[PDB]
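Follow-up to my post from last week.
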Amino acid sequence: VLEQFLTYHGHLYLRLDGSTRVEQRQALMERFNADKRIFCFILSTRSGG
Amino acid sequence: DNIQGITKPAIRRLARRGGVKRISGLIYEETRGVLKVFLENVIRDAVTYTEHAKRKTVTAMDVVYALKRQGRTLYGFGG
Amino acid sequence: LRDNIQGITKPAIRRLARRGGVKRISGLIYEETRGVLKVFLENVIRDAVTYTEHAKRKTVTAMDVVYALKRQGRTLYGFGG
Amino acid sequence: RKESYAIYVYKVLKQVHPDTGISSKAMSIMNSFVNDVFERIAGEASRLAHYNKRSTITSREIQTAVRLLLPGELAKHAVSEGTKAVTKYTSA
Amino acid sequence: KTRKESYAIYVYKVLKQVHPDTGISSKAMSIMNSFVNDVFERIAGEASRLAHYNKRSTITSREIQTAVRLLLPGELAKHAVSEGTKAVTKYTSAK
Amino acid sequence: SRKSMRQS
Amino acid sequence: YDDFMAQTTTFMSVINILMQLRKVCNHPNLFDPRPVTSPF
Amino acid sequence: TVALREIRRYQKSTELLIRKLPFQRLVREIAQDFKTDLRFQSSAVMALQEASEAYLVALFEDTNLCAIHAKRVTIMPKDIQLARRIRGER
Amino acid sequence: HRYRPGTVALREIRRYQKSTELLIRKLPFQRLVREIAQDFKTDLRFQSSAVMALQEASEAYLVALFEDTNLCAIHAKRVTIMPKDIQLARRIRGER
Amino acid sequence: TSVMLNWEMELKRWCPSFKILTYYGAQKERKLKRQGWTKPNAFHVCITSYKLVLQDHQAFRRKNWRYLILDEAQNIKNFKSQRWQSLLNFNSQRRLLLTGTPLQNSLMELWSLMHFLMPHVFQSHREFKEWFSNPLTGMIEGSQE
Amino acid sequence: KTRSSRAGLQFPVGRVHRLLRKGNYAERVGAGAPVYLAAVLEYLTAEILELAGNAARDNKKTRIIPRHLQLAVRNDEELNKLLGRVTIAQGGVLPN
Amino acid sequence: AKTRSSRAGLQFPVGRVHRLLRKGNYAERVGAGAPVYLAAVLEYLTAEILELAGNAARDNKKTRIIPRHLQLAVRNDEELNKLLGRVTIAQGGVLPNIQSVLLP
DNA sequence: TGCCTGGAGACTAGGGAGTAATCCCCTTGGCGGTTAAAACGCGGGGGACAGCGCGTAGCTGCGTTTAAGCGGTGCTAGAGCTGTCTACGACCAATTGAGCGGCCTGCGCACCGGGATTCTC
DNA sequence: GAGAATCCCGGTGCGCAGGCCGCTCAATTGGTCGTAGACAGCTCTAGCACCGCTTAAACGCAGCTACGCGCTGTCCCCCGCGTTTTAACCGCCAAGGGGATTACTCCCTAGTCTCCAGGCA
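User reply:
Got it. Predicted complex:
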């Protein structure tokens, strides 16, 4: 639902929902830290290690 | 040796009643043995029942009880 | 709860066959065995639920299953009674 | 004096097939069948009572024994018949 | 916390009589208790039916002897009848 | 201490 | 929220009601989205 | 042709297929071992014959099924052995 | 290295006949039992002992049925077990 | 399990002298990597996951460990959990729990960790609950002065 | 006034009660147990008799013979299950 | 005070068997020697099955009887196998029996 | 048709609800890992199944031969029923010890680890 | 001769089986007292053992051909093994609820006994 809301409002986001594969998590971290366009990074509190 | 009294045509009749088309020649001895085993078991139980009653005559009720305990009830003689 | 018959797994049916002494198994054996187990469980569970409902209970105890199996002719030892 | 269900079986037959008779051997078959199902239902009622630590065989025991023994459609029709008979008996 | 009658101690006594060194687990003891209960029910029911057939109102040693003969196979039945008649003779002698 | 004649 | 708090007093325990209330506070679309209407 | 006609003839009938006197002799011979000087009611021997013939017909049906499963029309003793082994009477 | 067909099957036959452990996973069987029971009566709770008893009875029944099926397969000069074998075993047993 | 490779990396970075054994892999690989590990001076430090120790507790429990180090000790905070019971009786000369948050929900988690560390100082949890947990929770909730 | 007539049945509720009492099924027999048992027995008898009469009509006969009872039992699946292990004297077997 | 089992020389309880027979609704009356006979038969059957089970246990280098031993004992003895033919023993397994045609 | 037997009609004691209390124990959505049974390829061997050709063993037809079946008769073993009267089992108070959990702790059994033997190719 | 699977002997740890301790409740002991049935004694039924005809079924041979079985020849489908999926399963975080057991009370409802007439064999 947050994806729907953010895409409606125009905020670019990345997602790490606890079901993403481990090799993808480091890639997402590096992209978010490197890209200044990505406004939000929705996350699950119990995930990510 | 009264087991030969169960003649080969009688075994054929029983097989035909069961829908058997062709019968091998060695079926007759096998079915005589099977019938002997079945009769031995049922008659042993019936004689046990008759002895328990202090009777010297094996009544139809004894055979009915023996068959019932063997797992195959028989209707028409118990009443 | 739906389509739980697939929980009876192909390796599980193979293991049961191996305990039964089967060397080679056809591919269509799994569906037949699933159906047979479904029928057997249906009968036993129906009898057990009848026994539990008679006692005005809502929990199916092992004694009820043992009584159901004994009624079916499959008396089971080691679970009481 | 020997007791049998022949008279009641004949009455039921006349109710269901008024113009159809029954031979003596068939009547014996029917008496044996009635006795068999009676003994089976009573034995199951006895086991149900003993399992539940109850000293009395009531209508619940007979109904449960009927449900356990008889197959589906027969079981439900017999349960309906027994409930109807008991309801009529209590209200008379 | 309630009494639950079982044949555990008697089965253990018989086991010690037969094998003084071997022991038995809880599942095996439960199986033995179930077996004893099942055989007891079989013999008692057969005896009750035998008494009912002969229009007798009592279960005696004769009824149980006939029940054992009916239920058990050959050598088992013969030895069981021997043991039972020995037990009843000793019980009557002890008064 | 106990033996059965069935096996022997 | 009022419907769930009414379901508190009657099979759902306090834990199930608690989780449903948390979901309601999050978003009602977690229960059923608004329908896409089309002709019959 | 004759086999199918014979099947239908015996299938429609209800009379006992085994002759009565040989079966009575066999029953008495079997009962001789268990007890001496045993008397039999006629109804008892008739009941024994009914049960024996029903048992044999049911067994033959199961053996026919076993033979058909072996892609054979003739019934062989191995079929009887398998029928009894699967039924559990072995 | 590669064992010829039939050797590993016999090896696991011996392994599974040496042991007495249950061969079906407990959770799938518990779900199957609950799925079958909900049709007869809703809101029924199963004790763990009841489910274990059901699993033991079902596994014993299936093992005996597979023994009969294998005997059917050896009859008619085969080694593989086919659905016709199970059907013949069940029909001779008196089921269906 | 996620931190296992990082810990191996840290051990190799700081102390290359230590013979590091890592216990990841399937059952066959684990058994192969075990073979001949009872030999003296065969491995110095072993790294393994909570799931693998729980599954292979028969192999690890028997051996006489000198130190037993538990990274992220909050995994042991529930004494009713199977992990705490399985890891409680390991043969260790010394024990060391590494965590960032020793207390998360209630003082009972702290008692669980302390009992895992010094059983002879924190023998009873009912006594601990009566002495500290209940009154302090009351103080936080305002039910006690 | 007869108890069987009070219950609206044709079978002897009194005789069924006496058989349940004399039989060792339980030390106490309720009032409704004989009525229920008599109703069940009467319904089963009516079902099998109706089927046997239909079989007799199909054979252009006016009396029910054991063959008709055998055909009625074996043709009805539920009654065949109920009397599966039962042999009917002079009944024969189903055509096949 | 001397128990009836002591008088009969048995180990199984005669008094308990008598109480079970009386309370089981088998007959109006229960004879004096019926519990003694039934207890003797039960003790004999228990002795037979336990002797075979212990013999099975010794072959496995184990002192305590487990259910597998009882299953092996029952199935290997033909008479006990017939007695317990329709009985399933929990955690009993099956006898090792591989058909000859399946062997290489 | 002449009974036994099921059915009113009065007491009466206890079996079986109600009603606490009481103790035991998880219970269930949504989350997040994480292994080890499943699930999925796939190459190839071998078993399944389809011919095909014998040749022998079941089947059919016939003419004897045999004994099952049926109807009298005849004699008694023995099944079934009845009257006596005892021995035996059901109840019933007092004893009392054998058999229940409660609680503990040796010890048997599960498991691991090298080295050796056995099995398959 | 290689590999792979068991097997076999020490060590070791854990949890449960076998034992000891109170306690109680259910066997046991010593009585009374109905009555179930063990035992004569009788009766009369049907089970058995003999005939002597009728004739339908059983049997032995001959001729025949139908199918059971062995032998080949595809070919497909299932097994053994490697690689990838995923779903059992543990952990969590919450607030209290079941839901079967054991004790009290108490009141319908069966059993028991008497008498009678009518259902039924």
